[PDB]
mmCIF file of all heavy atoms in Angstrom:
data_model
loop_
_atom_site.group_PDB
_atom_site.id
_atom_site.type_symbol
_atom_site.label_atom_id
_atom_site.label_comp_id
_atom_site.label_asym_id
_atom_site.label_seq_id
_atom_site.Cartn_x
_atom_site.Cartn_y
_atom_site.Cartn_z
ATOM 1 N N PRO A 109 -47.241 44.911 -52.754
ATOM 2 C CA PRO A 109 -46.978 44.056 -53.842
ATOM 3 C C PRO A 109 -47.002 42.556 -53.496
ATOM 4 O O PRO A 109 -47.473 41.775 -54.195
ATOM 5 C CB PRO A 109 -45.532 44.412 -54.359
ATOM 6 C CG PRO A 109 -45.555 45.948 -54.120
ATOM 7 C CD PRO A 109 -46.173 45.979 -52.621
ATOM 8 N N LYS A 110 -46.414 42.246 -52.408
ATOM 9 C CA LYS A 110 -46.371 40.800 -51.781
ATOM 10 C C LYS A 110 -47.834 40.355 -51.615
ATOM 11 O O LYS A 110 -48.131 39.250 -51.915
ATOM 12 C CB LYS A 110 -45.528 40.806 -50.458
ATOM 13 C CG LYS A 110 -45.706 39.545 -49.723
ATOM 14 C CD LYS A 110 -44.912 38.384 -50.528
ATOM 15 C CE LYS A 110 -44.897 37.067 -49.660
ATOM 16 N NZ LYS A 110 -46.358 36.630 -49.495
ATOM 17 N N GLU A 111 -48.630 41.145 -51.112
ATOM 18 C CA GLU A 111 -50.077 40.847 -50.865
ATOM 19 C C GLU A 111 -50.783 40.729 -52.096
ATOM 20 O O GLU A 111 -51.737 39.839 -52.327
ATOM 21 C CB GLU A 111 -50.711 41.895 -49.810
ATOM 22 C CG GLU A 111 -50.012 42.003 -48.541
ATOM 23 C CD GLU A 111 -50.635 42.910 -47.577
ATOM 24 O OE1 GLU A 111 -51.688 43.461 -48.016
ATOM 25 O OE2 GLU A 111 -50.120 43.209 -46.459
ATOM 26 N N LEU A 112 -50.548 41.546 -53.083
ATOM 27 C CA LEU A 112 -51.290 41.565 -54.361
ATOM 28 C C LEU A 112 -50.948 40.203 -54.969
ATOM 29 O O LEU A 112 -51.784 39.501 -55.480
ATOM 30 C CB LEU A 112 -50.821 42.694 -55.268
ATOM 31 C CG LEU A 112 -51.161 44.114 -54.990
ATOM 32 C CD1 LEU A 112 -50.490 45.131 -55.735
ATOM 33 C CD2 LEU A 112 -52.733 44.238 -55.030
ATOM 34 N N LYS A 113 -49.633 39.786 -54.948
ATOM 35 C CA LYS A 113 -49.309 38.505 -55.522
ATOM 36 C C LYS A 113 -49.877 37.248 -54.739
ATOM 37 O O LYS A 113 -50.368 36.461 -55.442
ATOM 38 C CB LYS A 113 -47.763 38.427 -55.477
ATOM 39 C CG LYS A 113 -47.196 37.041 -56.072
ATOM 40 C CD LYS A 113 -47.665 37.036 -57.556
ATOM 41 C CE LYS A 113 -46.892 35.826 -58.212
ATOM 42 N NZ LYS A 113 -47.041 34.530 -57.606
ATOM 43 N N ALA A 114 -49.898 37.435 -53.532
ATOM 44 C CA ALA A 114 -50.606 36.381 -52.671
ATOM 45 C C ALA A 114 -52.126 36.250 -53.078
ATOM 46 O O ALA A 114 -52.573 35.071 -53.219
ATOM 47 C CB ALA A 114 -50.434 36.624 -51.199
ATOM 48 N N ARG A 115 -52.800 37.361 -53.205
ATOM 49 C CA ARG A 115 -54.225 37.344 -53.597
ATOM 50 C C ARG A 115 -54.384 36.712 -55.006
ATOM 51 O O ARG A 115 -55.182 35.902 -55.104
ATOM 52 C CB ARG A 115 -54.818 38.693 -53.552
ATOM 53 C CG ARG A 115 -56.223 38.812 -53.801
ATOM 54 C CD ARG A 115 -57.048 38.039 -52.753
ATOM 55 N NE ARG A 115 -57.113 38.600 -51.578
ATOM 56 C CZ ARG A 115 -57.968 39.651 -51.116
ATOM 57 N NH1 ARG A 115 -58.791 40.074 -52.031
ATOM 58 N NH2 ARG A 115 -57.829 40.180 -49.977
ATOM 59 N N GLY A 116 -53.399 37.124 -55.873
ATOM 60 C CA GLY A 116 -53.559 36.626 -57.256
ATOM 61 C C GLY A 116 -53.322 35.180 -57.224
ATOM 62 O O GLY A 116 -54.195 34.440 -57.946
ATOM 63 N N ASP A 117 -52.304 34.648 -56.598
ATOM 64 C CA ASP A 117 -52.055 33.205 -56.514
ATOM 65 C C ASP A 117 -53.277 32.517 -56.074
ATOM 66 O O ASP A 117 -53.724 31.435 -56.589
ATOM 67 C CB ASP A 117 -50.868 32.965 -55.669
ATOM 68 C CG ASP A 117 -49.564 33.452 -56.225
ATOM 69 O OD1 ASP A 117 -49.559 33.742 -57.522
ATOM 70 O OD2 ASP A 117 -48.615 33.633 -55.533
ATOM 71 N N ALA A 118 -53.882 32.920 -54.977
ATOM 72 C CA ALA A 118 -55.099 32.401 -54.360
ATOM 73 C C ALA A 118 -56.239 32.261 -55.238
ATOM 74 O O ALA A 118 -57.035 31.361 -55.235
ATOM 75 C CB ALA A 118 -55.335 33.005 -53.024
ATOM 76 N N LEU A 119 -56.388 33.352 -56.054
ATOM 77 C CA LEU A 119 -57.444 33.467 -57.007
ATOM 78 C C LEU A 119 -57.216 32.863 -58.412
ATOM 79 O O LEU A 119 -58.180 32.637 -59.201
ATOM 80 C CB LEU A 119 -57.847 34.917 -57.230
ATOM 81 C CG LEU A 119 -58.388 35.621 -55.980
ATOM 82 C CD1 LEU A 119 -58.382 37.153 -56.214
ATOM 83 C CD2 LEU A 119 -59.669 35.121 -55.612
ATOM 84 N N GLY A 120 -56.045 32.365 -58.643
ATOM 85 C CA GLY A 120 -55.649 31.839 -59.858
ATOM 86 C C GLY A 120 -55.458 32.873 -60.874
ATOM 87 O O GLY A 120 -55.772 32.661 -62.150
ATOM 88 N N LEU A 121 -54.984 34.019 -60.616
ATOM 89 C CA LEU A 121 -54.690 35.141 -61.452
ATOM 90 C C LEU A 121 -53.216 35.540 -61.459
ATOM 91 O O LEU A 121 -52.546 35.531 -60.293
ATOM 92 C CB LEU A 121 -55.453 36.390 -61.014
ATOM 93 C CG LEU A 121 -56.973 36.224 -61.178
ATOM 94 C CD1 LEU A 121 -57.611 37.579 -60.523
ATOM 95 C CD2 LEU A 121 -57.465 36.042 -62.547
ATOM 96 N N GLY A 122 -52.697 35.850 -62.650
ATOM 97 C CA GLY A 122 -51.351 36.231 -62.733
ATOM 98 C C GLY A 122 -51.393 37.719 -63.147
ATOM 99 O O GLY A 122 -52.425 38.391 -63.173
ATOM 100 N N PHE A 123 -50.240 38.264 -63.473
ATOM 101 C CA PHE A 123 -50.229 39.760 -63.676
ATOM 102 C C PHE A 123 -49.522 40.015 -65.070
ATOM 103 O O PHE A 123 -48.418 39.515 -65.336
ATOM 104 C CB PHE A 123 -49.492 40.585 -62.591
ATOM 105 C CG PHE A 123 -50.210 40.445 -61.319
ATOM 106 C CD1 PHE A 123 -49.889 39.462 -60.420
ATOM 107 C CD2 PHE A 123 -51.230 41.325 -60.986
ATOM 108 C CE1 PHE A 123 -50.580 39.243 -59.187
ATOM 109 C CE2 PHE A 123 -52.069 41.176 -59.870
ATOM 110 C CZ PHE A 123 -51.698 40.180 -58.918
ATOM 111 N N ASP A 124 -50.091 40.901 -65.806
ATOM 112 C CA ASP A 124 -49.619 41.271 -67.119
ATOM 113 C C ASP A 124 -48.809 42.583 -66.932
ATOM 114 O O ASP A 124 -48.340 42.849 -65.869
ATOM 115 C CB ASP A 124 -50.819 41.553 -68.212
ATOM 116 C CG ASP A 124 -50.267 41.098 -69.630
ATOM 117 O OD1 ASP A 124 -49.684 42.054 -70.294
ATOM 118 O OD2 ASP A 124 -50.752 40.022 -70.119
ATOM 119 N N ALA A 125 -48.624 43.227 -68.126
ATOM 120 C CA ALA A 125 -47.781 44.453 -68.038
ATOM 121 C C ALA A 125 -48.353 45.499 -67.003
ATOM 122 O O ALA A 125 -49.440 45.743 -66.859
ATOM 123 C CB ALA A 125 -47.799 45.203 -69.483
ATOM 124 N N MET A 126 -47.296 46.235 -66.401
ATOM 125 C CA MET A 126 -47.624 47.317 -65.443
ATOM 126 C C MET A 126 -47.969 48.526 -66.267
ATOM 127 O O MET A 126 -47.529 48.618 -67.431
ATOM 128 C CB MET A 126 -46.392 47.607 -64.567
ATOM 129 C CG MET A 126 -45.876 46.481 -63.661
ATOM 130 S SD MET A 126 -47.169 45.880 -62.506
ATOM 131 C CE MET A 126 -47.290 47.457 -61.489
ATOM 132 N N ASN A 127 -48.753 49.403 -65.660
ATOM 133 C CA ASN A 127 -49.185 50.672 -66.344
ATOM 134 C C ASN A 127 -48.842 51.736 -65.408
ATOM 135 O O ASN A 127 -49.343 51.829 -64.323
ATOM 136 C CB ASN A 127 -50.676 50.599 -66.629
ATOM 137 C CG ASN A 127 -51.049 49.603 -67.689
ATOM 138 O OD1 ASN A 127 -51.007 49.801 -68.837
ATOM 139 N ND2 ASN A 127 -51.245 48.314 -67.296
ATOM 140 N N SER A 128 -48.076 52.741 -65.910
ATOM 141 C CA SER A 128 -47.707 53.936 -65.169
ATOM 142 C C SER A 128 -48.761 54.969 -65.356
ATOM 143 O O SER A 128 -49.482 55.066 -66.264
ATOM 144 C CB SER A 128 -46.407 54.330 -65.584
ATOM 145 O OG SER A 128 -46.282 54.685 -66.991
ATOM 146 N N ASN A 129 -48.732 55.973 -64.346
ATOM 147 C CA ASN A 129 -49.651 57.055 -64.413
ATOM 148 C C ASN A 129 -48.978 58.436 -64.200
ATOM 149 O O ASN A 129 -48.813 58.762 -63.064
ATOM 150 C CB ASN A 129 -50.738 56.849 -63.434
ATOM 151 C CG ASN A 129 -51.750 57.961 -63.463
ATOM 152 O OD1 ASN A 129 -51.554 59.031 -63.929
ATOM 153 N ND2 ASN A 129 -52.998 57.616 -62.727
ATOM 154 N N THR A 130 -48.743 59.215 -65.277
ATOM 155 C CA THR A 130 -48.087 60.469 -65.147
ATOM 156 C C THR A 130 -48.965 61.425 -65.893
ATOM 157 O O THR A 130 -48.469 62.351 -66.440
ATOM 158 C CB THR A 130 -46.623 60.576 -65.448
ATOM 159 O OG1 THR A 130 -46.482 60.355 -66.908
ATOM 160 C CG2 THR A 130 -45.760 59.629 -64.675
ATOM 161 N N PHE A 131 -50.324 61.115 -65.864
ATOM 162 C CA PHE A 131 -51.350 61.938 -66.550
ATOM 163 C C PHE A 131 -52.289 62.500 -65.557
ATOM 164 O O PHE A 131 -53.262 63.186 -65.845
ATOM 165 C CB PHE A 131 -52.071 61.163 -67.630
ATOM 166 C CG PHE A 131 -52.694 59.798 -67.089
ATOM 167 C CD1 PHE A 131 -53.810 59.771 -66.413
ATOM 168 C CD2 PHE A 131 -52.022 58.597 -67.423
ATOM 169 C CE1 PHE A 131 -54.396 58.610 -66.008
ATOM 170 C CE2 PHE A 131 -52.522 57.412 -66.966
ATOM 171 C CZ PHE A 131 -53.714 57.447 -66.239
ATOM 172 N N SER A 132 -51.894 62.367 -64.233
ATOM 173 C CA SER A 132 -52.818 62.870 -63.121
ATOM 174 C C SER A 132 -51.792 63.058 -61.941
ATOM 175 O O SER A 132 -50.699 62.450 -61.931
ATOM 176 C CB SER A 132 -53.901 61.968 -62.831
ATOM 177 O OG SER A 132 -53.351 60.619 -62.346
ATOM 178 N N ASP A 133 -52.175 64.022 -60.969
ATOM 179 C CA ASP A 133 -51.245 64.206 -59.869
ATOM 180 C C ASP A 133 -51.660 63.426 -58.597
ATOM 181 O O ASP A 133 -52.856 63.328 -58.274
ATOM 182 C CB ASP A 133 -51.302 65.695 -59.471
ATOM 183 C CG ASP A 133 -50.643 66.491 -60.580
ATOM 184 O OD1 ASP A 133 -49.950 65.999 -61.490
ATOM 185 O OD2 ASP A 133 -50.747 67.753 -60.473
ATOM 186 N N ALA A 134 -50.694 62.949 -57.857
ATOM 187 C CA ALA A 134 -50.926 62.151 -56.655
ATOM 188 C C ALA A 134 -50.615 62.990 -55.541
ATOM 189 O O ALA A 134 -49.929 64.042 -55.692
ATOM 190 C CB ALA A 134 -49.956 61.018 -56.632
ATOM 191 N N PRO A 135 -51.195 62.662 -54.275
ATOM 192 C CA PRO A 135 -50.934 63.531 -53.107
ATOM 193 C C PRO A 135 -49.455 63.530 -52.721
ATOM 194 O O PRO A 135 -48.837 62.446 -52.779
ATOM 195 C CB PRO A 135 -51.743 62.820 -52.059
ATOM 196 C CG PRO A 135 -52.886 62.167 -52.802
ATOM 197 C CD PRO A 135 -52.101 61.596 -54.064
ATOM 198 N N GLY A 136 -48.919 64.613 -52.388
ATOM 199 C CA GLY A 136 -47.518 64.683 -51.937
ATOM 200 C C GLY A 136 -46.499 64.843 -53.126
ATOM 201 O O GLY A 136 -45.302 64.853 -52.872
ATOM 202 N N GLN A 137 -46.941 64.931 -54.340
ATOM 203 C CA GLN A 137 -46.257 65.032 -55.511
ATOM 204 C C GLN A 137 -45.593 66.364 -55.558
ATOM 205 O O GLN A 137 -46.283 67.429 -55.513
ATOM 206 C CB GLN A 137 -47.181 64.747 -56.768
ATOM 207 C CG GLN A 137 -46.413 64.540 -58.064
ATOM 208 C CD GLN A 137 -47.392 64.029 -59.088
ATOM 209 O OE1 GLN A 137 -48.004 62.991 -59.038
ATOM 210 N NE2 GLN A 137 -47.590 64.887 -60.103
ATOM 211 N N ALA A 138 -44.208 66.370 -55.697
ATOM 212 C CA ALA A 138 -43.574 67.761 -55.756
ATOM 213 C C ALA A 138 -43.789 68.502 -57.003
ATOM 214 O O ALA A 138 -43.945 69.782 -56.906
ATOM 215 C CB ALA A 138 -42.059 67.544 -55.820
#
């Protein structure tokens, strides 16, 4: 997250609403 923010700041980009994903399975998911 820290790096994402740093990249955004350098590019002149901010961040809007986060989007969750529980419509697909991730590796290691119980």
